Amino acid sequence: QAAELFLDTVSTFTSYELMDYKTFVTYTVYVSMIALERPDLREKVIKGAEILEVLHSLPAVRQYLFSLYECRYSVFFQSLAVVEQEMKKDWLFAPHYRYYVREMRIHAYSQLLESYRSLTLGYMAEAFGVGVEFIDQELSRFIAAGRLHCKIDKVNEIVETNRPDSKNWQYQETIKKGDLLLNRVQKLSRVINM
């Protein structure tokens, strides 16, 4: 719902006590990396004037943007510093914590996984400079979610993929929202029917 609003940039300025210019330019880009994916980025975030401003400041047009387009999880760990930097100092983005970081880390990983059907867990585990035990354990955390659908046998260093979009999956999500709604109906039934 925010992304709708964020994309707007007719109102370059403000009367400054509503929000501030520097903050607002930094904020739009930050929201971009999380909220959007690469057909949207190529299209919208080349906005020109805006791209100048991010360079006139700390990285985002740099490190995060290059990493998203490149779809690598090779070099992106330097930007794990930014979560720490920006979120903690802020009062707006603090409340969000691990959900903001964790969804961003998954996003990057997912693109790399989608590239190669038959992916070598091994090549990644070494060169990306990470613990073997960390990448897998967090991967299995992500598969359990239904976010990823990488089919793994851990003693080997080979992973394969299946259809993450399927008729069976779409029906499941439809029921899944349906359940939450069912509960509301009961709450209504509680108060009334006296």
């Binding site: 760990f77 330097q78 794990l80 979560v83 720490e84 691990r98 070494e126 400079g129 990470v130 960390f134």
Partner: peptide, 21 residues
């Protein structure tokens, strides 16, 4: 929450895997 961001970062950021290579 907050603990995991600091936790992931010490493990990720600070290498002892890419320095043993």
């Amino acid at each position: 929450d907050d603990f995991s961001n600091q936790l992931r970062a010490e493990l990720e950021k600070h290498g002892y895997k890419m320095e043993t290579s």
